[PDB]
Design a protein around this nucleic acid. Structure first.
Ligand SMILES: [Zn+2]
Lengths: 330, 171, 45, 380, 610, 45
DNA sequence: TGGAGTACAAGTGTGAGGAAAAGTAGTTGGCGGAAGTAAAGCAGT
């Protein structure tokens, strides 16, 4: 039922998507000239679209200048019957070269119809066949709040040769939610961002299998989700353990000169320092002009957070938290 | 796995002690209608020890021993190919103050130059300097001298004094 | 086999696979006609 | 290939004698079967000979060496011994040769590791090829010990032992020369006999028609309807024996049939012993510092208070002991709604029997129909 | 308001964590993580029954075949009475017949008379719109979709003296343009495959396509799934496929693509939450609760949870739970291939502050897989929730109230033929064991009364005398006919072979028979160290093999003894493969067959290397 | 048994041929040679 | 009593289908002007 972290390849699925996106090219390029009058077959297909690499879907905000008038000239059966004839007469030749199941799969998807059989359901390799069991048992026992048993499943799941980054870091709440003889959870997140923190440019030209960016890769212009989770989890733990200078020096070491979220937590690391240093327990020389740095850091790092892209902070309340730290100072 | 390289490794290896230089550009075509921002690796420049960028910055005499250094490690030098060079301090002219030197090497320059002159050394806020010498001719004529590329140019002074702001000849 | 096909690429022949027309009278099955290449040429160059 | 396929055949037999209490002459019987196999390889013209061998072949010649020795072990007790990763059938290439592995080609080193277990009667048809290249007929006693078969099938679903002799009279009535469910041979062609010619396959269909007729045609009011509601409810039940948990493994391996996503219906303690079986899968099946560091942060045992040193007196009960609960559950012994619940017991004993013999239902819907419409033909 | 959004997107997925903190120094959990805190929440069914009546693919155009809502008619407009719960589903021969009130659980009414109105086409979509809370009432009109036409119905003036549901209709609009329509929504406003239209819905049933429309037709989205909803009542529609979400205001000339879902996900379902701002979306791999914007109602993107299943036939149903401080949202993803549900809990609060709690899943009835699940509004910390399901290959609509605190007909349709000729011909063998078991219940009973006597010891002394004679005749024939270079029965006797049942006396016979042959030419297999394949454990002795089989059939047997006493004999008279030739046999034949191979295969025929 | 010493974690390390010069506990490249029991002689002057 | 035939069930001909380790390819990152005192033949008006 759940997703499996397997780079599973089979020839019959390598055919039927090469069979599909080939036909998609011709029926589009047919529409690319009938709309005018009025080389792997997949990579050439993905040279039209931009892969999102921050999200699953490339969302575009609508209250903007992406506005467009409606094409009211609709598509009827008279136009649709002729725009698919010359592709299908040009598609009829490799349909005999594929298998009988692929030839019936393509005729099914030519008119709608969605496959009712999953590409993972007949792997039958006895190793992958146990991964499919051990992942569906993994998410099920995480769901049942059964942590001492789900720890045993994930310990045996990461040792089978072929498992991936998918199941690895996502369900590593099993260390943090355990708290019996835990590894504190945060040390596993440090493990992830040591060996998977890449600085490669996201190449976007190769067809991707078995890695999909928005939760497991870490390229430039996308700080990885386990990287920013390592930031927030080591800040909440940093507050619950009252070391703040370790993280504030640790976040100091990468300038991520692209995003805004690591600037806000680098702002928020000083704001937690300005909270704790401004107690002063009097009932007075260096403790005043120490805090006035941290007040200044927050007003700049939040300002440079706004300089970057979309990360809508409450930039009004956070100013009103620093003013209350100066009323403690006066 | 990325790790921190300490300068004791670069002494054993007989290599440099280089920190990575990152340099983000701007590709504004047509007055900034299409901006392209790319952080680019520009090689590793070598890094002075016990600076901001060395890994021995805020570090105890105990911890310098645990990282294979002298307990009172001084810093201030660069490790380049194991050889341990440093930048020599120089004496230069005081900044931003017009000195009033007389020099026989000024009459060597052109005809009717006296030995007199006012030499100023102006430095920018990025510590880059510029010298502007102000020569006295034997005609009542005063010239402004500067070296731009490696050449040396000689414009008259009331050309500049009328170019800086809107002036009368009584101001 | 692919050590042999790389020798013809200097010559300039478009070494592609066979057809179902080129399958029956050559002793090879019709389904496995992908690993079985036929190299022709083009007459101008 | 033959030097390593024999080397893995050696490691399967050496497992059996050392651990499963097999007699030492079992290896001696197996070599003549292996050596005549090589003579069939020898007879073929060496240029483009294409010898047919598969990890199913090292099971088939192991089965013939155990039914010439006339043992009660079967492919019911072979597919349970390989899906539980006991004898080196799966990933046999990865562990065993260690020097021939590097030189072997990419296809020959993929045929040795048994990636997919035998299905839809794949293991029967390899015996048919094996009984056709070498003659297991006319040299060896091709007589399946069908008395040691049904005693497992009696104790499998906790039926009364009367059905052991209710079955054999049905077998004796519909049989060739009364006894001798003879094992079939196929030297013929790439045509898989749909006659249910396999002798082991014939005994199952007799066991199906027996358990139907002895309960359906009960004029003697001996087997009541509420006993079926104390048996079908009793058989459709999960327990933690090593036969039950081992049967759960074989449900996992086969994706085609239903009752393969049966792990949703598992329990607490039945899951833990699956994970203790998982320490018998990895042992068959410069940037190693990254995995060494992660295996420190995920130690494979429990974090503390494990079940190794001081655990219990008993947790797991054995196959002799759950039947002492099953037969003590169906304690009462002394029509439209009667034949409805006879369909509740029959489809469940059928489903539990397909997973032990690696055949589909269409492999068994034929095997009922070739038996049922040959058995009424005795009277007419 | 939190801190961590993108503006374009917003996350709270499976167990990494949220990404926000205000640092509110207030001693009251000084963090506003997007995960609220509580204890567990497990869900238990309360089963009821409400009503009743290529293969590797499925067609996306079918949407629903059942519907249910608290409905309000014009009789409830005028009169003070309010609140009538109904149900409307498709059933019959081809499923072309279209047709109440909750007493204490949702049950069919007393009069049990469904208004089985007829359409001459199978029904593909049954839906009611539901009404806005800013309209005052609940609407009473149901739109339906066939393979051939489009009809609109209207529920009109149900009674209380008969509780009969009399309806009206509209003239069914057929396919003027011939393409299959997909989804209607009201809030005749339709979306055909690639193109849509606004419908002029009439009041008159005693007796159309408006002239403003549009299209979204993508040449390369090969699937046939489209979907439309009015977005927050502003005469703005959202036009879907499995690849993008197109917002269209049909009041103006304006169209904007928001979702683009081609690269790593696709759009599965979109159920409009009656919260006119907060409305849920289901892609593959993620559940998105993208709401409406406060100021300019175009599209807001709110806190989304990723979806660990991956499938091609996923659907969702959403039910609001209205509470004092907040509003919960339970979101039920299901699939047509399996029975399991997967639900997640979002909490809408006052200032557009969403949260998330955790994830859970429940099971269903072991026959069928769900194709329609439908919630009940229930007229309005121990959460209760109620809904009703409709499975595949079953037309039995059940009823489930989740609270916080396997016969196949192929086995049925095989046996019991309709031949009165062979009605007793099968019973002739059934009557044969009516004679033969009584023949054998006393033939073994003859051996029961003979207990350690000498007349049966005479039978085994003769058996120990008759074993050796026919064996030694055979042992020499293997020696006289030895040089063949090319079998063990112990059943050559024919007298009775069935006239002794006393196992410890019988155990010393075959041990003496092993003692009788100490020299060569004959070897024997074991019995106590090999019989463990039936019991899967230690077997010390063959005499206590019976002990765990006597204690295996104590209770379930008449007299419990003579059945087990002869199965043990049937094993030993089948496991008696005892006439193996000795060491002279295998060694000569292992080397003679190796002679038949060349020196090419001598090295390839070699054991014992490690 | 011939051994070396890692320059970082000070773990003793036998290094065969066709091995990269690395530590095998950490991954440190610089790797220093230990001294074994071997006779050298001096005058005590 | 007879033969029609239509089925049922058997038998023969023929290449298509699911599998994995090696290899290839496919695309990036990344590395090696404040110096004197003096002569001379050459220019200038
Ligand atoms: Zn080391």
């Amino acid at each position: 039922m759940f997703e499996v972290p397997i780079t599973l390849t089979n020839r019959k699925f390598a055919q039927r998507r090469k069979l599909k996106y080939q036909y998609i090219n011709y029926i589009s390029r047919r529409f690319d000239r009938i709309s005018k009058k009025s080389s792997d077959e997949e990579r050439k297909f993905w040279k039209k679209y931009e892969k999102p690499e921050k999200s699953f879907e490339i969302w575009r905000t609508v209250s903007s200048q992406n506005k467009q008038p409606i094409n009211k000239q609709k598509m009827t059966y008279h136009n649709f019957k002729k725009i698919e004839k010359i592709p299908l007469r040009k598609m009829e030749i490799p349909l005999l070269h594929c298998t009988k199941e692929n030839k019936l799969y393509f005729q099914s998807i030519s008119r709608g119809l969605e496959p009712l059989k999953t590409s993972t359901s007949e792997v039958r390799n006895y190793r992958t066949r146990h991964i499919v069991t051990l992942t569906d048992l993994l998410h099920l026992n995480v769901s049942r709040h059964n942590w001492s048993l789900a720890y045993k499943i994930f310990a045996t799941l990461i040792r089978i040769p072929g498992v991936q980054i998918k199941s690895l870091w996502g369900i590593g709440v099993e260390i943090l939610d355990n708290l019996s003889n835990s590894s504190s959870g945060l040390d596993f997140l440090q493990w992830m961002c040591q060996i998977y923190s890449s600085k490669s440019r996201f190449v976007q030209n190769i067809n991707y299998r078995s890695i999909v960016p928005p939760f497991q890769t870490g390229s430039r212009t996308h700080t990885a989700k386990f990287a920013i989770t390592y930031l927030w989890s080591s800040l909440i733990n940093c507050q619950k353990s009252m070391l703040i200078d370790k993280i504030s020096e640790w976040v100091l070491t990468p300038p991520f000169m692209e995003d805004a979220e690591v600037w806000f937590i680098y702002a928020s690391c000083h704001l937690l320092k300005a909270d704790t240093l401004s107690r002063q327990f009097v009932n007075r020389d260096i403790k005043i002009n120490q805090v006035i740095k941290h007040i200044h850091y927050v007003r700049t790092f939040l300002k440079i957070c706004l300089d970057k892209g979309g990360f809508a902070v409450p930039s009004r309340l956070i100013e009103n938290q620093l003013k209350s730290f100066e009323s403690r100072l006066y | 796995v990325e790790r921190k390289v300490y300068p004791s490794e670069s002494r054993q290896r007989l290599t440099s002690y280089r920190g990575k230089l990152l340099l983000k550009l701007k590709w504004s075509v047509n007055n900034g209608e299409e901006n392209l921002f790319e952080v680019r690796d520009c090689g590793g420049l070598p890094v002075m020890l016990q600076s901001n960028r060395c890994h021995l910055n805020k570090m105890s005499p105990y911890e310098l021993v645990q990282h294979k250094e002298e307990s009172d490690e001084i810093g201030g030098y660069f490790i380049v190919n194991g050889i341990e060079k440093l930048i020599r301090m120089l004496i230069v002219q005081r900044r931003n103050h017009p000195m009033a030197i007389i020099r026989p090497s000024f009459a060597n320059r052109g005809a009717s130059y006296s030995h007199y002159g006012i030499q100023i050394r102006s430095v920018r806020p990025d510590q880059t300097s510029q010298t502007n010498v102000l020569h006295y001719l034997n005609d009542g004529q005063v010239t402004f001298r500067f070296s731009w590329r490696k050449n040396e140019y000689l414009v008259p002074v009331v050309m500049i004094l009328k170019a800086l702001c809107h002036t009368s000849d009584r101001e | 086999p692919s050590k042999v096909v790389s020798l013809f690429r200097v010559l300039g022949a478009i070494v592609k696979g066979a057809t179902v027309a080129q399958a029956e009278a050559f002793g090879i099955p019709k389904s496995t006609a992908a690993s079985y290449k036929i190299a022709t040429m083009k007459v101008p160059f | 290939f033959l030097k390593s396929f024999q080397f893995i055949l050696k490691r399967q037999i050496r497992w059996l004698i050392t651990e499963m209490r097999f007699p030492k002459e079992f290896e001696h019987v197996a070599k003549i079967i292996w050596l005549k196999i090589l003579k069939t390889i020898n007879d073929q013209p060496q240029e483009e000979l294409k010898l047919q061998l598969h990890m199913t072949s090292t099971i088939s010649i192991l089965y013939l060496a155990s039914t010439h020795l006339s043992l009660p072990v079967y492919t019911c007790d072979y597919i349970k011994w390989i899906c539980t990763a006991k004898m080196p059938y799966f990933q046999a290439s990865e562990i065993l040769p260690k020097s021939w592995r590097i030189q072997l080609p990419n296809y020959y080193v993929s045929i040795l590791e048994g990636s997919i277990s035998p299905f839809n009667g794949q293991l029967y048809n390899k015996i048919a090829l094996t009984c056709g290249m070498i003659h297991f007929k006319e040299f060896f006693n091709s007589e399946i010990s069908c008395q040691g078969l049904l005693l497992k099938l009696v104790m499998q679903c906790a039926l009364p032992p009367e059905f052991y002799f209710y079955t054999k009279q049905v077998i004796e009535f519909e049989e060739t020369d009364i006894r001798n469910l003879t094992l079939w041979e196929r030297t013929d062609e790439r045509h898989t006999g749909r006659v249910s010619n396999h002798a082991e396959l014939r005994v199952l269909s007799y066991f199906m028609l027996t358990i139907n007729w002895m309960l359906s045609f009960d004029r003697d009011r001996q087997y009541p309807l509420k006993w079926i509601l104390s048996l079908t409810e009793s058989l459709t039940q999960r327990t933690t024996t090593s036969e039950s948990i081992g049967r759960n493994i074989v449900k996992v391996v086969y994706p085609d049939k239903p009752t393969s996503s049966d792990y949703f219906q598992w329990s607490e303690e039945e899951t833990l012993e699956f994970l203790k079986w998982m320490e018998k899968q990895f042992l068959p099946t410069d940037q190693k510092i990254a995995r060494r560091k992660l295996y420190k942060i995920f130690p494979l045992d429990r974090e503390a208070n494990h079940d190794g040193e001081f655990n219990d007196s008993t947790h797991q009960l054995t196959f002799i002991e759950d039947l002492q609960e099953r037969y003590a559950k169906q304690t009462p012994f002394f029509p439209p709604a009667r034949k409805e619940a006879i369909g509740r017991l029959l489809t469940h004993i059928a489903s539990q029997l397909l997973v032990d013999f690696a055949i589909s239902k269409e492999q068994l819907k034929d095997c009922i129909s070739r038996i049922k419409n040959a058995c009424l033909h005795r009277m007419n | 308001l939190g801190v961590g959004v993108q503006g374009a997107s917003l996350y709270c997925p499976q167990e990494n964590y949220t990404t926000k903190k205000q640092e509110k120094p207030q001693w009251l959990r000084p963090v506003d993580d997007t995960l609220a805190e509580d204890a567990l929440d497990l869900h238990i069914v309360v089963k009821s029954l409400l009503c009743d009546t290529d293969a590797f693919f499925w067609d996306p155009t079918v949407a629903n075949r059942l519907d249910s809502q608290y409905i309000q008619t014009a009789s409830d407009l005028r009169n003070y009475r309010d609140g009538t719960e109904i149900i409307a589903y498709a059933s019959g021969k081809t499923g072309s017949v279209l047709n109440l009130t909750r007493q204490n659980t949702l049950h069919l009414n007393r009069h049990n008379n469904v208004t089985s109105i007829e359409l001459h086409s199978p029904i593909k979509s049954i839906k009611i719109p539901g009404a806005s809370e800013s309209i005052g009432r609940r609407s009473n009109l149901v739109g339906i979709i066939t393979e051939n036409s489009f009809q609109i119905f209207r529920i009109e003036s149900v009674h209380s003296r008969s509780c009969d549901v009399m309806v009206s209709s509209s003239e069914p609009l057929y396919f003027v343009e011939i393409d299959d329509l997909q989804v209607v929504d009201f809030a005749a406003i339709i979306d055909i495959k690639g193109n849509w239209s606004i419908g002029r819905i009439p009041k008159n049933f005693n007796n159309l396509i408006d002239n403003l429309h549009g299209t979204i037709f993508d040449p390369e989205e090969l699937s046939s799934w489209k979907r439309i909803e009015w977005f927050s009542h502003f005469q703005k529609i959202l036009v879907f496929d499995r690849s993008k979400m197109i917002e269209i205001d049909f009041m103006n000339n304006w169209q904007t693509e928001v979702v683009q879902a081609k690269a790593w996900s696709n759009i599965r379902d979109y159920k409009r939450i009656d919260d006119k701002n907060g409305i849920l979306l289901t892609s593959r791999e993620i559940i998105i609760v993208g709401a409406s914007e406060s100021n300019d109602p175009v599209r807001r993107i709110s806190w989304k949870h990723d979806l660990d299943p991956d499938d091609t036939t996923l659907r969702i149903t959403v039910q609001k739970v209205k509470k004092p401080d907040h509003i919960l949202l339970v979101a039920f993803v299901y699939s047509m291939r399996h029975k399991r549900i997967y639900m997640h809990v979002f909490s809408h609060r006052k200032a557009n502050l969403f949260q998330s709690l955790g994830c859970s899943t429940v099971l269903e009835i072991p026959g069928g897989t769900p194709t329609g699940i439908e919630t009940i509004l229930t007229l309005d910390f121990e959460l209760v929730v109620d809904f009703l399901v409709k499975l595949r290959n079953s037309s039995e609509v059940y009823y489930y109230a989740l609270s916080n605190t396997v016969d196949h007909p192929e086995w049925a349709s095989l046996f019991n033929n309709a031949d009165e000729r062979e009605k007793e011909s099968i019973g002739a063998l059934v009557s044969q064991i009516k004679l033969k078991e009584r023949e054998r219940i006393s033939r073994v009973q003859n051996l029961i009364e003979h207990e350690n006597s000498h007349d049966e010891d005479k039978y085994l002394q003769d058996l120990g005398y008759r074993l050796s004679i026919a064996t030694n005749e055979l042992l020499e024939s293997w020696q006289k006919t030895k040089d063949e270079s090319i079998h063990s029965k112990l059943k050559n006797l024919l007298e009775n072979s069935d006239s002794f049942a006393s196992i410890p006396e019988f155990s010393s016979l075959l041990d003496q028979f092993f003692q009788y042959y100490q020299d060569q030419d004959v070897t024997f297999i074991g019995f106590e160290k090999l019989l463990h394949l039936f019991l899967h454990e230690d077997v010390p002795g063959l005499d206590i093999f019976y002990n765990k089989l006597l204690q295996c059939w104590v209770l379930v047997s008449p007299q419990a003894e003579l059945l087990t006493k002869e199965i043990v004999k049937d094993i030993i008279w089948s496991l008696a493969r005892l006439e193996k030739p000795s060491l002279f046999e295998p060694i000569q034949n292992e080397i003679s067959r190796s002679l038949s191979g060349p020196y090419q295969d001598i090295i390839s025929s070699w054991d014992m290397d490690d | 048994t011939l051994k070396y010493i890692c320059a970082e974690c000070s773990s003793k390390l036998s290094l065969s041929r066709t091995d990269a010069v690395r530590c095998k506990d950490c991954g440190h490249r610089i790797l220093l040679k230990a001294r074994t029991k071997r006779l050298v002689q001096f005058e005590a002057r």
